[PDB]
Design a protein around this ligand. Sequence first.
Ligand SMILES: O=C1CCCc2nc3c(cc21)C(=O)CCC3
Length: 283
Amino acid sequence: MEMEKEFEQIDKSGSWAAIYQDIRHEASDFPSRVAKLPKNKNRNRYRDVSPFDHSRIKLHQEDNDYINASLIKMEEAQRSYILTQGPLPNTVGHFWEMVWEQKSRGVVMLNRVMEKGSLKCAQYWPQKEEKEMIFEDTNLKLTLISEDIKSYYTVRQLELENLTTQETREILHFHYTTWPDFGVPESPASFLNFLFKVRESGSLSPEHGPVVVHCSAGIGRSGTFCLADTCLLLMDKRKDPSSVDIKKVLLEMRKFRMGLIQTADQLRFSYLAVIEGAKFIMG
Ligand SMILES: O=C1CCCc2nc3c(cc21)C(=O)CCC3
């Protein structure tokens, strides 16, 4: 079925939970043996969220190459994404090592450091120009260059230096600051505006390594971001945009990381975002 009318048909019939459970039943199951080794327990935020072995990002280190991060490679859309958990106190250096080794231009953050009174990820970037950060375990330096605070998101320019080679690179930090502590946003307008700002920066384009995107677990809000982007790109590329099937795209993405889209409300929000976004693209 088309999307917008499939949407109203699920609303009128109140069957979002049943649609979402079908997805969970059909989703791929692949091994995640490296994630479950005992030496990696303090590298995982949640015991039930792990990268599959076949798609995990490997650190270029011979001691321990493990990080909780997955490469989502979308062949028809010609887009790649790295989805990862919010960094932990003992993985902030690994996180920036990955950004460096994978040649990423942008980092997309969809959570606040504190939500619901609890810490959802480490404070992994510097907050003042004159107070830079040094990650001694991975030999990297990170400096805040500039910061632009808007009503729904903040963009930061960062300098990452490989202290071993003295090479430097500019990284863009795109921080969506207004996702509610509970539920999903009422309108997708600010999320779509944010996606378009990431796009306009070059961070999603083939001349750079994959964008790094995270929330707390790296599967829920993060899944909404890449699912909406890929669906809109396919609607631009195909002769028949109504052929784009958001449930099929989500099941393809779940071949590369488990659990993408965590609730039936996040599923409905993803439909809403693609539907509204397809009208703004034209027109
Ligand atoms: O597809 C395009 C390219 C032109 C820029 C652009 N901007 C926005 C959208 C879509 C596009 C939306 O879907 C809503 C937010 C703004």
